[PDB]
Structure formats: structure tokens, C-alpha cells
Amino acid sequence: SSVRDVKTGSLPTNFLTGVYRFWRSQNPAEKPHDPVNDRLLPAVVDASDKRASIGTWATTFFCTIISCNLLGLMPFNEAPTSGLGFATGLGVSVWATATILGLSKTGFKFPFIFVPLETISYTFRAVSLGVRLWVNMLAGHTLLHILTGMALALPFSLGFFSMVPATFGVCCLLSALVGLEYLVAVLQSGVFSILSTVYVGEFNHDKFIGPAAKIVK
Template structure:
């Protein structure tokens, strides 16, 4: 008489265990999704901190711009923090920074030339970033995109002056972003090539006793320039990534794009 009761209790226990197992599967999946999202946010925050640090160091090298430095230091974190998808923007900035840094460092390998010291590669990067920002702006603002070029509170007759001027300034971003990187990398590598050629010709133009200290001095100078080139490679990668993040984040933020979109609708 007890067997049915025992069988029922066993079936009840199995059903409860299956219910617990079924409830644990969505919970585990949710936990893994939360952990991956937290990892993306953490990586984005780390990259943003690195880029902001490079930006502040770059700004500190310009004495004439120091009165504006506190305002600029608040501007970049505000644009990055206001982004719709901060983790995706941080991942994109990380990939861009690593790509440009690797391209810059290739020029310091003997017999190699940095891809960023070529005008086509550098301007191609600048144009692609500008096209990405423009496409995102058109997607976010639509026909209100010209409102991005009109400051808030501007009288409507002045809009016909601001829009053409700001359009020209905005278009030149595509050129200035790549040309800045190209000129900085080309100048450093050209200087290294000139000094290396002079160092190789030095033994044939001096006596033995004068050649030893002169060669040592040139070797120290070349070592210092190579170290400076490493610093320039990192800084230029950071500057390009920071400006690209600002350009893309400018349209990737609803908080920044929303008020600008309302300007044209009021005209």
C-alpha cells in the first residue's frame, strides 16, 4: 500500500528538480549577459580614460591655450558620457587607436615605412571617419541636419550665413584629420633618415680621433630621436582617436543632437 505513495513522492521530487533546473538556465544566461555587458562597459571606460589622459597631456603642451584647458577637459568627457552606446563607442575608439598606433610603429622598424607617413593612407582614414560621422548625423537628424551648423538662439536671417561657413569648416575636417597625422609622421621619419645618412657618412669625413666622439654624439642624438618618435607615434594615435571619437560621439548622442535638431524646425 505504501508503494504508490513512494512513487508519487519520487515523481513529485523529480518534477521539482526539473523545475529548479529549468529556472536556473535563464538565470545563468542572464548572468552571462550581464557579465559580458559589464566587461564591455569596463573596457570602454578604460579606453576613454586613456584617451582623455593623452588629450590633457597634448593640451598642456600649448601655453597659449591653457586658459581654455579646463573647459576643454570637461567637454570631451561630456561628449563621450552622453553617447547612446558608450561601450560600442569605446570599442570602436580602441580599435582605431590600436590600428593607427601599429601603423605608426611600423615606421620605426628598420627598412620599413609607416603606412601613416603616406598621404593616401592618412587622408583615407580621415575621410572614412568624417563619412562615418556624417552618415550617423544624417541618420539621427534627417532633414534637420543643417541645424547642426546653427548655434542656439541665432536669429533666422543669420542662418543663411552660418550654414555655408560651418559647412565649409565641417568639410575640412576630413582633410585636416588625415593631413595632421601624415605631416607629423612624415616629418619625424624624414629627420631620422637625414641624420642616419649623415651618421653613415661621418667616418669618411673625419679623422680617427675625431670620429669616435662624433659617432658617439650622433648615436646619442639618434637614440633620443627614436625615443621621441615613439612618443609622437603614441600621441598622434591618441589625438586622431580623440578627435574621431568627438566627431562621431557628437552625433551619437541624443542629448547633443536633440536640441540642434529643433533649431531648424523653429525657423
């Protein structure tokens, strides 16, 4: 009833426009054989409704994972994706989305000895997609804990504001490690959503209906 008024050309609207169009360009549509006109328009609309919304899902996962990754770089906060269940559940749910899409394409029917190892390489990416994010968010924070525990002992044992350069040379290293944490917090969201587009767009291929009759020449 009473929704808020939005300025046109806001910075979040521009940013989310660029983000959504980026993730929508990962699984582009297929250019048909016939030229696109009013004859081919229901076939194009129908192909656009038999394609999964991987653009919307991928920017959903990109936005939630980059916000949970950048929570771990604000003070007094831990990343939610440094939990095993959170990050690994996002990974298993992307893999289950790709599998449910691929199962509903054929029949909801589950598919030599070369193919079960292809299956245990396909069922591993449920584990891999989640725990890459989880171990990347956990390992930098763990190294940060350890190396600032080693960086606190030398101003503990020596004087405060005395013998400065041995603490300066480890505080520069801690600063570089939190900068690497920012880079990893952006790149792992990017890698997760690129891989979600890849895994779901493996099964995002249907039959273009097209014209079954024509008036040629």
C-alpha cells in the same frame, strides 16, 4: 566549432579591457531624470541602442593606428600610416562616419553666410584628422633620413673608430629623435582616437524615450 581556449587574466585581455573601457568612457551615457528601475530599463536599453558604438570604433582605430605607427619603429619596416592614402583615408572615413551618423539622425537631408563658413570649417576636419597623422608619421622619418645622412658623412670622410666625439654627438641626437618618434607614434594614435570620439559624439545625442505615464504617490 573549435575555438581556442583563453587563459583568464591574460595580459592582452587586461590591456584590451583597459583600452576599451577608456574609449567607452569618452562618450558616457546620460543620467536620466527618473531613477533607474524596471520601469526605466527599456528606455535605458533603447538609449543604449540609439547611441553609436564609438567605444568599439575608437578602440578599433586606436589599435590599427598604433600598430601601423609602431611598425615604423621596427627594423626593416615602414609605417603604413606614413602613406598619404592610408592615413588620410582613415581620417576621411572617421569624418564620413560622423557625417553619416549625423545625417541618419535627422533625415539624410543635407544642412545666413555665417553657416557656410561653419561648413567649410566642418568639412576641413576630414582633411585635418588624416593629414595630422600622415604628416606626423612622415616628418619624423624624413628628418631621421636627413640627419642620419648627415651623421654618416663624418665617419665616411674621417676614419672608422677614429675621431669619435663628433659622431657621438650626432648619434646621441639620432637616438633622441627615434625616442621622440616612439612618443609621437603613441600620441598620434591617442589624438586620432580622442578626436574620433569628439567628432562622432557630436552627433551621438538622441531623445530619451522615458515614461509617458506614471502612478505617482
